[PDB]
Each structure stands twice: as C-alpha cells, then as structure tokens.
C-alpha cells in the first residue's frame, strides 16, 4: 500500500540461549578431494542466522530504500545490532555485528535467560520512529495522524512445548499493550497499529515436532499470531524464502534457455500482471542496435536466489557487462527485457499487445505539415547544446539560495529561444556562416572577454562583407538584404541586452558600426 506499510518495519529476534547451540543433525559433505574427516553438522543457531541473513539480502536487493530492518539477538542481555537509519541498514554492518556477538556460549548459564527479553526489546524497538516516518510527520504539520507505523516481528527459537508458545503470546500481548500505553503519553514514539508476529520454531532433523503448527490467530486487533514450525537446515531456508516472497508481494522467475542451466529471479509481483508458481520466460536472441527505445510499463529490481552459482553468476556478469537481454513469454511475443542500469539489474515489462496508438495521423497532413524547409539540423544543434547532466554539488545562487538546476535549465532554454526563427526561409542571419559565433555566444548568460573580442571580430567581418557586396543567401536587392540583415541582428542583440552589460556594449558597438542611412 503506502510507504509505511505493514512490512515497512521488520524486526528480527534470534534465539541465543545455550539450548540453541548444538548441531542440527544435518552433517554436510564438504570433503570431496585419502580418509576425509567426519561430516560436519552446522548448528541450529548458525542455520537460522544465515537463513535470516539471506532473507535480509533478498529484501535489500529488491528494495534498496524505504524498507529498514533491525536485528535483536536474544541472549542474557538484549542487544540491537543496527538502528533504523538507512546508513546503518547495511548487510556488512550486520555481518560485523553478528561476528562481534560470536557463537552462543555452550555452558554459560542455560536457564538464566529466555527469549522474552528479545520480544520486549523488539516491541520496544518497534514503537520507535524511522527517518522516513519522521520526515512524513514533519511535512504533515498539524495533521501527522494518518501515518500508520505498522511493523512486523519474526522470532526464531526452539520452544520446548506449545505451553511456552502460548506463554510468550500472552507476554507479547501484555508488553505491546504496555508499550502502546506508554507511547500514548509520549510524543516521540508512535503507537503500533499492526504488529504481525511469526514464531518459527526449529529443531534438528530426526527429532519429533514438539510444537504443532498453528494458523492465524489474532489475540488482539494489533497482533497476528502465525507461528510456524519446521526442521532446521534447508527446510528453514525454504520457509524463509516463502516468507519473504509472501511478505512484500514478490514473485519468482525461471529464466531458461541461456546458452553456455536455468536460473531463478525474485522480483516485485506487479511484473506478472501481463500474464494474468514460477514463470518460465525464455531467453531470446539479443540484437545489437535494432531498436533503442522500448515501451516499458514497469522497472522492477531483481535478486537471484543463488547469486554465487555458476549460471546466475554468468547471467549477472553478462548483464553487468552492458548489453541487455530480451525474453519471450511462451507465435512468439516479445516480453520482459532485462537490463543493468549502472549496476542494478532491472526486469522491465514491455507491452506486447496491440498498441491503442496505432496508425496515428501522418505528420505531413497535420497542422504545419505542408512545409519542407524546417531547420531540423539547426534544432538538432540546439538540442545537443542543452543536454542534461546530474549535479551532486548544490551551489548557492546569491545569498543562501541553493538554486535547483532544473530551473537553471529552464531559464537557459528561455534565453536560447528569445529569437528563434523556425523555417529556413524566415531567417537569413542564422543561415549566414559569419553570425554563427554570435548565435553561439550572445545566447550565453554572461559573455566573457573572449566572447567580446569574438563578437567584435564577427561584426568587423560582417562590415567587410557588406563593403565587398558579397552575395548573401537568398533566404530583394543587395541593399535590401543588407538592411533586413542588420534588422535581424539588432532584434537579436536587443533581446539579450538585459542579460548582461556586455550585451548592451556589443549592442551599441553594432549601432555605431551599422550602416544606417
């Protein structure tokens, strides 16, 4: 929905008790190429943390902005690994914080602490305001009430029984009620409107499921209990993949037929509206420069699910090389086209259906279409002379006035267009090759001294040409064409006179040097 949706704020809490430290009974076979070592089983906490990290990676790639994530390990103490600022919502910072936390202690104090501390820290964290929420509240003065701060908290732990699950549910209900009550009086703390809770429970494979799965259950109009349960290892990874796919309204893609295996891409769901559980768009032959401008109705970022795999790496490297890739929906019809705009893989959504703007009227029959002397090349030069570029440094115009470069471009276009004849036959000064220095210099906002000497040389050359009675372009006597030429130059210069004093200078120099009868 809006920017501050229910998925806008996501808080993760991870079990850190010594009970969450043993292996998950899923020993791996890293030894490929004598007698290899015993197979190594990754600990349940390690699997949960790494799968959570993958969830974070997918969410960051698909949504670089407007979506932050915290991380609260649940140990004897309550530690938050990153704040809500966009600058602190980084993958490497999370990795460094997790490394600093270290593996769970095996035999420190198993029964000293529980996960409830993480839950209360999370709900206490959830009531905070992000930077974007603060900006929204500031801009909506005296009306900063329609700002839904709904979030979502996900918990990973190994509960011994469903009774503990219910106890945690009641505890989180009570503590969020207390947090809402505390936020009612306070000003710099928004009251939670919708805090969805997920309580994934993990266990080593080969052990029974101590807790049965439960469906949605709203213990309050501010909570949603959706506690899932699954074995550790790859199952947890798939559960988290499904969670992220159904959290932010995602979709899957199974690009195939890549010359050298298939690859999987995750992106926003709206890219599949043309088709209307993974679509199987097929690679099509990439033409070098057939067409340049397509009709794209969407630009959705993507993130491969196996970024380090050989096929995904090859495809991403090829896209990042610069060339685009055209796909095809399964007689063929062109469809979604991949591209890499500076290092961000975009999955466009072309439009293959019949264009409602087909067979438009011929421009030769519309208004102004029966004239064949248009200054197309002159306007091409005009276009190329006002091309745009970004500016990372905001300068000050006069005094504390940080000018917007867009208004600068607008005023430059206005200055250029003060006297612009449209058709070739209309003008003669612009058609003359002598005035090109004037046509390129006088238009400037502030002519320099070199501009001054160039304009003086140009008017001197024009005077010499008049003295020699050279044949000017036809564009009706020689005196008549000379007179209309001086009229054109005088009209041009006086228009830009107010721009700078040098313009008035060249104006009165022309007035003195003109051969006015």
């Amino acid at each position: 929905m809006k920017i501050f949706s229910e998925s806008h704020k996501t808080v993760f809490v991870v079990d850190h008790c010594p009970y969450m430290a043993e292996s998950c009974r899923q020993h791996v076979e890293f030894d490929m190429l004598i007698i290899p070592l015993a197979p190594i089983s990754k600990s349940l906490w390690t699997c949960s943390v790494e799968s959570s990290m993958e969830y974070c990676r997918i969410m960051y790639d698909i949504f670089p902005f407007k979506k932050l994530v915290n991380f609260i390990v649940s140990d004897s103490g309550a530690h938050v690994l990153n704040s809500w600022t966009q600058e602190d919502q980084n993958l490497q910072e999370l990795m460094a914080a997790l490394a600093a936390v270290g593996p769970p202690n095996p035999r420190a104090d198993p029964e000293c602490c529980s996960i409830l501390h993480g839950l209360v820290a999370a709900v206490e964290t959830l009531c905070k305001i992000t930077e974007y929420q603060h900006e929204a509240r500031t801009l909506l003065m005296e009306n900063a009430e329609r700002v839904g701060n709904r979030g979502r908290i996900i918990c990973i732990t190994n509960a011994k029984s469903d009774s503990h699950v219910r106890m945690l549910e009641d505890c989180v209900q009570e503590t969020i009620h207390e947090h809402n009550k505390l936020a009612a009086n306070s000003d710099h703390l928004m009251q939670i409107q919708k805090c969805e809770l997920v309580l994934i429970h993990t266990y080593p494979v080969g052990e029974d499921s101590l807790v049965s799965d439960r469906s949605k259950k709203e213990l309050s109009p501010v909570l949603t209990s959706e506690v899932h349960s699954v074995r550790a290892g790859r199952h947890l990874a798939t559960k988290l993949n499904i969670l992220v796919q159904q959290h932010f309204d995602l979709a899957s893609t199974t690009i195939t037929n890549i010359p050298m295996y298939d690859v999987e891409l995750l992106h926003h769901k709206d890219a599949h509206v043309d088709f209307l559980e993974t679509i199987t768009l097929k690679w099509c032959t990439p033409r070098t420069n057939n067409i340049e401008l397509h009709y794209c109705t969407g630009a959705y970022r993507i993130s491969p699910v196996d970024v380090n795999s050989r096929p995904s790496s090859c495809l991403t490297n090829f896209l990042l090389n610069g060339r685009s890739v055209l796909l095809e929906q399964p007689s063929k019809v062109i469809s979604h086209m991949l591209s890499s705009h500076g290092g961000e893989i975009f999955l466009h959504v072309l439009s293959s259906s019949r264009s409602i703007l087909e067979d438009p009227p011929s421009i030769s029959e519309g208004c102004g279409g029966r004239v064949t002397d248009y200054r197309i090349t002159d306007f091409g030069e005009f276009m190329r002379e006002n091309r745009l570029t970004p500016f990372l440094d905001p300068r000050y115009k006069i005094d504390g006035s940080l000018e917007v470069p867009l208004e600068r471009a607008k005023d430059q276009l206005e200055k250029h267009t003060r006297y612009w004849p449209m058709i070739i036959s209309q003008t003669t000064i612009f058609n003359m090759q002598a005035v090109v220095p004037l046509a390129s210099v006088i238009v400037k906002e502030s002519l320099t001294e070199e501009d001054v000497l160039n304009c003086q040389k140009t008017i001197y050359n024009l005077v010499d040409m008049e003295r020699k009675n050279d044949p000017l372009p036809i564009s009706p006597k020689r005196d008549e064409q000379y007179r209309i030429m001086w009229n054109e130059l005088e009209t041009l210069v006086r228009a830009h006179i107010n721009n700078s004093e040098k313009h008035q200078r060249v104006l009165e120099c022309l007035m003195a040097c003109r051969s006015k009868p």
């Binding site: 929905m1 809006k2 920017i3 076979e29 890293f30 190429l33 390690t46 943390v49 993958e54 990676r57 960051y60 670089p64 980084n90 600093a100 270290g102 593996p103 769970p104 509206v273 401008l293 009709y295 794209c296 109705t297 630009a299 993130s303 970024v307 380090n308 795999s309 591209s339 705009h341 500076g342 290092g343 961000e344 893989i345 439009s351 259906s353 264009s355 409602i356 703007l357 087909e358 438009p360 421009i363 029959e365 519309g366 208004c367 102004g368 004239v371 248009y374 306007f379 276009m383 190329r384 091309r387 745009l388 570029t389 970004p390 905001p394 471009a409 607008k410 276009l413 612009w420 058709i423």
Partner: protein, 485 residues
Amino acid sequence: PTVVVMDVSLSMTRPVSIEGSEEYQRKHLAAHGLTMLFEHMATNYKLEFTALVVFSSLWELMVPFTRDYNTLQEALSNMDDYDKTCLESALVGVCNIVQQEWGGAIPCQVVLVTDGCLGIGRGSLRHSLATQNQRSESNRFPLPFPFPSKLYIMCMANLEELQSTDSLECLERLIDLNNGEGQIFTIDGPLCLKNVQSMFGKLIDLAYTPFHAVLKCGHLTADVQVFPRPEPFVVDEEIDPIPKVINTDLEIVGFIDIADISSPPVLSRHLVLPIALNSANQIAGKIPNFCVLLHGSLKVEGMVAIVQLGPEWHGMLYSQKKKSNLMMSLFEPGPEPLPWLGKMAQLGPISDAKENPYGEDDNKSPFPLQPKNKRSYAQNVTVWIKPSGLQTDVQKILRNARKLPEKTQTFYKELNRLRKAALAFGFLDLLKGVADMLERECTLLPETAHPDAAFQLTHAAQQLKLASTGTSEYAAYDQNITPLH
C-alpha cells in the same frame, strides 16, 4: 478504448407516450443518443477506439474495436430484438474482449445503456448481486473491472422517480463495485428527445472532451491535443490521497540521449498532435508549426525531451510501422522517477558544469548514475544455503592453494573472506575443518616443494587453528590472515 454496451432486451422496445410527435420506442431514443455520441467522436475525438456489444440472454460483439465510426453509425439501425436482460454475462464478455484486445493496463471506459428493468431473477442483476457477492467460486463478479475503467450507465428510465419505484439501488451499487469510478445519468423530464440530447451532452462533456494543451519549449510554443487525456494519479492513500493531474502547459526542460535514457518505466504513452485554432492543409498546413519541427529534429538526432508537467512530475517527449509521430510518456510522479538518473530535480545544463560532461567528441556520458550502495549480485557475498555453494567455495580455496605461491594474493583474499563469513556465522568447527584440509593439502604437497609456498600454507593453517578457538587472538573481523614475508 470505449465499449458501448447497448441493452437490446425486450424491455427497450416499450413505446413511451411522448406528446405531439408519434410513439417512440426507448430503443430509438437510445439510437439517437449514441448517434450523437458517435458524431462528437468522429468530429472531435477521431483517434479514439470504440466498440459496441449488445447484450441479451447472451452477449454478442457485433462490431469490434474500430476507429471507423461510420460502421458503428449504421450498426445502430440494423439491430435485432433479443428479449432477455442479463447484465453479469455482458460484463463478463466486456472483460473478455478488453483483455483479449488491449490487455490489463490501458484504461477502458464502458458506456452502459440500461433501462431500469434489471430482470426477473437468475441472470438478472438483483439475483446476481445478492448471491455472487457472498462467494465467487471462480464465478467472480465482473463489476470490479481488472483495469482502470469508468462505468457510465445511461439509464434512460425516465426520471429518477420512475426507476426508484422498482430498481435503482441495484444500479447505484453496481457502480460502487467499480470503486466509484462512474456516474448514474437520469433523464429528467417527459423523455423528450431534447432531454436525451442534453443527457448525452453531459456525458460527452464529462468523459469525452479533448485535452488541449500548450507545448512551450523555452519561448517557442504550439497548441497540441494530447491523445488520450491523461488519467489522474495518486501517490498513495495515506500521506497524499489527493489525486494529481498534469498542468495545462508542457514545458520542455532539456534533452537527453536516447541511449542514456535506456527504456524508462512510463505510465502511459500519449500522442501529441498540433491543433489549429482541404482548408486544414491549405491554411494550417502551410503555416510553420513547432510540433513538426520538434518531431523531425527528435527523429533525426535520436534523442528525447524531458518535460515538466508540474511540481514533482516529469515525463518524456520522444519520436516514434513506417509511420512516426511525437509520442509523449509520463514517468512516475516523484523525486526520482528514474533511479538510474539521480534525483530528477538535480539535473543541470552542461554549461553550469565545470567541463563538458558529455565530452568534446560526444563519447563520455554521466548517465547512468551508480547507486550509492552496491547490490549483492555485483558485490562478493557469501551464501551457504545449499551444501553445493559451500562445497564450491572449499573446492575453490583448495584448488588455488595448489597454485600457491603463484596466486598468493587471491588465495589469501578468499581465505580471509571465508574466515570472516565463518566468524559472522559462528561456524568455528567449519574453520577447524578447513584448517584440517589445509594441513592435508600440505601433506600432499607436490615434488616441486616451493620453499615460500610451504611457509604460507603453514602460517595460514596456524592462523585458522588459533582462530578456531574463538579467543580474541583472531576474533577480529578486520583480521585477514596476512601472508608471511
């Protein structure tokens, strides 16, 4: 795309007792009124596609989408008299033809011609609305059109009083299932032809007036007709619910290279046709226009032109079958509609730049802008979901250890990355294991016996052995196992 759904049911054959003139059937009133609508179309909305499906017990498409309004005009006078009313089937068929022809994103106004006689039951409007609302069961109610439509109902059921006796709440609710995008039109008066003419004039003024605009590029200007009219847009429903519409003037704000622009995500592709304010070619044809010059220059040079349609809105004015014209787009209203162009409110002319960013030879280009934070597929992330990836990493680190000391730096970098990832994931026993494989490869050293190679692998193995303890000796993430000199 306009689909004129005309009810041909027997209910429309009822004569109405008008005063003075002869008896006129409601079907014939409907006839004169659409004739008026199709005229205002062929005269002032010529580019607009339209279709006319007449619905009965079954719905049938007599005339598909076409710009030829003469065919539609004669189609009104060649109509049969099927005699059953069923709106749900008609709406389902309209969805079918719209999706089949255009798709799911193009707006498709629907003109509906009912008579306030929904039906007796079953296929009737009341029976469908009262039952299908509770459950779809793959029989989803077609009233919520899966595209930004606008349901206009020419309920020519005399005054609102006449249709309030039996059924008008059903119609007004039917409009609401379209999310309020529509309007009920009631002909007030004794069903006179002038009344229905005023009715259809109101419809024309509401929905089918051309969107005239002035295209001002600096100081040059021209009068254009942006076909089709632009739809209003809303940012969201929480912070800014007020819809926004483009300004009457389109100010060209610069130009950008068509290769740099890539293929931008637009809202809707709009034609721009000059409007004069064989006479057209003999008078308006010979006077120099600006749209012709702009389109020709854009085609020849091969660029586009950014446009400012208002505060925070921004579009594009590009050129182009063999036929070509000056079509205009609409970017997403916001600060950065194109994320690879920077904040679109931060684009300046090359004159204000220190040097010429585009280059003297027209080779350099600031576009596209690299995002401030790199993504994952471009960076070097470590993923250990499947055992295959971790096996690939360990195979890579083992193979490069054979090339030691040729690729010493790469092997050290990969080992440091693996150690950092293990420390982040707490995979200390994995670090001990990879130390064991490093020792094993040391035991299987080749007969070359490079002196510096053995020292590096032994030092690395010692580093992993000491770091696997979990103590502060190498717990630091900044530690990268510097190779021995």
